[PDB]
Design a protein around this nucleic acid. Structure first.
Lengths: 150, 205, 82, 123, 80, 129
RNA sequence: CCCGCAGAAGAAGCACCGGCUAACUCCGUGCCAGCAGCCGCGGUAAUACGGAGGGUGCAAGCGUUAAUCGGAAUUACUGGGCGUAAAGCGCACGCAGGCGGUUUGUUAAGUCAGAUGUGAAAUCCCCGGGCUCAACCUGGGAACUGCAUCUGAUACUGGCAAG
RNA sequence: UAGCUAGUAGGUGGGGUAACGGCUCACCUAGGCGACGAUCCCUAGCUGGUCUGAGAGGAUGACCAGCCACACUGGAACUGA
């Protein structure tokens, strides 16, 4: 099973020889609640095709997150194009205390106990890239022990 | 202040059945469930992220009949206790004397249960308590006063109570009409579809 | 002068008293030297209406601290109950 | 930004001034309502807005908006004003309270009544 | 032996009395840097036994004059 | 280096790791050797070796799990300009215990776990992770 | 406080419903009247203005104004920047100041550790207890993240000495 | 606001005080404070606390408790522990 959810959609335009034509972009995140998430960004002349193109973009480009138990291994930082996010693990029963694209990425990826904030520009494309980036760089004790000690 | 409006229209906005109109007639044959309760009932109810948190918080309140000030206080206390806040909150809601009288059968609806509690006709450990939000603890003894054991409504409420599922966490006697709060119900034996995490997200900002 | 007197606390019509060692010129429940027990007048079956911890009262009387009449009555009661 | 630079002169937290100066942190003030007129707003909106020029008890002379659907104010009447500006011509940041002193609740008003000073119709 | 602040003379021009600055290395409350703070302090030496730059121990005493409540204990470094 | 030779050594380590260098060198100090001991006993480097008598040189040997360096971050914490001292009950967990803090205790230079064990804090040299 | 007495009998409002923001239709009006926190709305509809009907939220209250912190990482210690967005002095030299390669020794100022004394009570927090419950009251505790003093440590910073 | 200060800073004696002390006086010395902000101007009772904030902080100091200061304004004493 893969959770789906749209983040945002807007109505980019382009000035043509005569008037000005229109498109739509949609940003979607896909995951399974077991530490895999991916985002997608499709453009189309109409919203539903933009959303679908986004969803197939998102079902490829799935990463692996090394979750702990529904929360994060350790506090993690992410940046992308002037968008800095901070996630840290929480206690059980603490929800997804997260913002916009933060909440959606953390949800579909299978996190339940996070404590997140986004600092720079909160443009969803960039905050979702920042969040995915932070999550994919997270270390669990297994690989850190593997890479250095026991 | 309670809520004194039409009971079913409150359930139809929430969609699901709320047990606040209880008896023989088995609603959707009472009156027109599953249209939100107004001139645009047929209109599509698709609603936002904040709308679903709001809808379930509203539904929990409508079940127990708690207003927003007490419900907020319940959340504060549950979020202060140790353990997950959502089941803390449901347990606080289910330890309410209003509710316990309902769930022990005697008391047809939680508003009739509250009608009983308020009217000096319930004893907790052998003395009259008429606060609906009174917290029952493990091993109180909730019982109808003798002066009100001859009341016909409590006797009638009892029969339509074993058709309702009887909670495990409390044990009641119908002959000598009297019960016993055994333990704080767990989330699991609270037979419901409450999604308490959207509630805790609602007040968490 | 040092007197052992009752400082009236609690709520309205539900008095609670702190047994306080104090300089007699202060306000009743103002600046004090030491708390030596408490007295709960409205406690009938309600348990522990009076704790005094009489070693400190003994110490302060041995230094010329006077007792109020109510504290003296409370000391008799605690001694008799013993 | 260097730690010496911050030790030597620390960060000055900028102070933001109130945009209702004449109140002076009083939630309302009493004014004298020297003149009433109907001024014209910014280029996008076309209407005549009921405004009065009012002298507060604290000496400020200031411009107030008589909101609502109707009017009774005059050239000396004593009114009460509260904060909140209108996207009107620069200088309007006060808002007469209808029903508070010499002002009256607007007539035949039946929704948002408490904001116009109109009392509940006996029905 | 009570506290014995240990400082360095900075002026010997009042007769029978010196001025002694004490360096303390304190952590800045907000910025967390360790700064240097000075405490100049009029001290009494009866015998004019001190010269500028000397490093001296002082102790606290009763007030000897207006702004003079410390007295000399030793000279630890008769630096010239 | 010119004023902070310990941020020099950490800068060399992370620059050589991002350069996929096998070994870095720097002029040695005895505290450089102390921190190098902490690292190579925590598995963050392979080895080191100080050669030279009038001009010793510390020869750190970097360590890659595959094509990725073992150290992700190594940041100087107490610097000349902020010295950082922690009491043993406020010693820092670096990446939730998955990375070390090397502290300077009055019983030598140890890791953060070792210090909070032996119940003594000290000056926080760096965070490795 | 308890008991009796009738009798549903004596006991609901206020804001909002374009987006942010839960909740929409019709009439009226026609860039007027008006609204507005922002975006903005109104020139025949206009879910945005007035009335209605409906709905939402809160409820003996509900809105508005003021004010403080938050959101604001928007003075950034934690936690920001300076090529072009605001921002490297026109350029040096230089005192104070800040910072300071390496190895010993010493000291023990910083630092760290232990102790002790103090850190009023109340408040806050935890576990209880009493008020029919709650608020409130209260018992015990913890906390008071500090200050001082003594004993110890000596990696690091400082001092002093020698390189 | 960059200099400020002649009981000004210190010292010897008198005196005074419950007490130490430029507290006062006579003489002597010529200092003292200041860029680690003196002086001057402005504002302000201080604290436990309160509010807000994840925190660090900000903002506050109503009630209650502790300390200060005042009692029409300005002087002054007396009496008295």
């Amino acid at each position: 099973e893969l959770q789906e959810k749209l983040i945002a959609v807007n109505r980019v335009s382009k000035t043509v020889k005569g008037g000005r034509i229109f498109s739509f972009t949609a940003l979607t995140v896909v995951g399974d609640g077991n530490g895999r998430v991916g985002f997608g960004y499709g453009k189309a002349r109409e919203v539903p095709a933009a959303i679908q193109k986004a969803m197939e973009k998102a079902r490829r480009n799935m990463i692996n997150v090394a979750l702990n138990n529904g929360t994060l291994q350790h506090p993690v930082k992410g940046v992308h194009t002037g968008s800095r996010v901070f996630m840290q693990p929480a206690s059980e029963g603490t929800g997804i205390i997260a913002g916009g694209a933060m909440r959606a990425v953390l949800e579909v990826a299978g996190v339940h106990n996070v404590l997140a904030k986004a600092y720079g520009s909160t443009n969803p494309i960039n905050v979702v890239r920042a969040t995915i980036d932070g999550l994919e760089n997270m270390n669990s004790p297994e690989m850190v022990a593997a890479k250095r000690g026991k | 202040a309670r809520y004194l409006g039409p009971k079913l229209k409150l359930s139809r906005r929430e969609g699901t059945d709320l047990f606040l109109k209880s008896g023989v007639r088995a609603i959707d044959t009472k009156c027109k469930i599953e249209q939100a309760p107004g001139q645009h009932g047929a209109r599509k109810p698709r609603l936002s992220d904040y709308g679903v948190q709001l809808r379930e918080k509203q539904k929990v309140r409508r079940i127990y009949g708690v207003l927003e000030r007490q419900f907020r206080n319940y959340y504060k206390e549950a979020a202060r206790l140790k353990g997950n806040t959502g089941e803390n909150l449901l347990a606080l809601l289910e330890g309410r004397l209003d509710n316990v009288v309902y769930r022990m059968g005697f008391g047809a609806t939680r508003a009739e249960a509250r009608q009983l509690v308020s009217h000096k006709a319930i004893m907790v450990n052998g003395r009259v308590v008429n606060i609906a939000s009174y917290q029952v603890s493990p091993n109180d003894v909730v019982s109808i006063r003798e002066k009100a054991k001859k009341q016909s409504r409590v006797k009638a409420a009892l029969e339509l109570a074993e058709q309702r599922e009887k909670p495990t966490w409390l044990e009641v006697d119908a002959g000598k009409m009297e019960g016993t709060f055994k333990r704080k119900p767990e989330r699991s034996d609270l037979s419901a579809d409450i999604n308490e995490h959207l509630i805790v997200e609602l007040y968490s900002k | 002068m040092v007197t052992i007197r009752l400082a009236r606390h609690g709520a309205k019509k539900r008095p609670f008293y702190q047994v306080v060692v104090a300089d007699s010129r202060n306000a009743r429940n103002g600046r004090f030297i030491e708390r030596v027990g408490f007295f709960n007048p409205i406690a009938s079956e309600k348990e522990e209406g009076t704790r005094l911890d009489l070693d400190r009262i003994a110490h302060w009387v041995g230094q010329g601290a006077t007792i109020s009449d109510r504290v003296a009555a409370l000391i008799k009661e605690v001694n008799k109950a013993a | 930004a260097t730690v010496n630079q911050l030790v030597r002169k620390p960060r000055a937290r900028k102070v933001a001034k109130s945009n209702v100066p004449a109140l002076e942190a009083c939630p309302q003030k009493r004014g004298v309502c020297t003149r009433v007129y109907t001024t014209t707003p910014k280029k996008p909106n076309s209407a005549l807005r009921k405004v009065c020029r009012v002298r507060l008890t604290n000496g400020f002379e200031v411009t107030s908006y008589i909101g609502g659907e109707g009017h009774n104010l005059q050239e000396h009447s004593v009114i009460l004003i509260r904060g909140g500006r209108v996207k009107d011509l620069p200088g309007v940041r006060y808002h007469t309270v209808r029903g508070a002193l010499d002002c009256s609740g607007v007539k035949d008003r039946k929704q948002a009544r408490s904001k116009y000073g109109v009392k509940r119709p006996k029905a | 032996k009570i506290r014995t602040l240990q400082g360095r003379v900075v002026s010997d021009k009042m007769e029978k009395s010196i001025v002694v600055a004490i360096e303390r290395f304190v952590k800045h409350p907000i910025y967390g840097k360790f700064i240097k703070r000075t405490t100049k302090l009029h001290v009494h030496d009866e015998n004019n036994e001190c010269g500028i730059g000397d490093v001296v121990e002082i102790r606290e005493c009763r007030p000897l004059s207006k702004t003079k409540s410390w007295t000399l204990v030793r000279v630890v470094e008769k630096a010239v | 280096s010119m004023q902070d030779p310990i941020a020099d050594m950490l800068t060399r380590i992370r620059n050589g790791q991002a350069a996929n260098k096998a070994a870095v060198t720097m002029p040695s100090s005895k505290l450089k050797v102390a921190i190098a001991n902490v690292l190579k006993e925590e598995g963050f480097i392979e080895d080191f070796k100080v050669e030279g008598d009038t001009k010793p040189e510390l020869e750190l040997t970097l360590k890659y799990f595959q094509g990725k360096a073992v150290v992700e971050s190594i940041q100087r914490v107490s610097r000349p300009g902020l010295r950082i001292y922690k009491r043993k009950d406020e010693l820092p967990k670096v990446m939730a215990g998955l990375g070390i803090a090397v502290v300077s205790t009055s019983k030598g230079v140890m890791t953060d776990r070792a210090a909070r064990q032996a119940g003594l804090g000290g000056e926080i040299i760096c965070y490795v992770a």
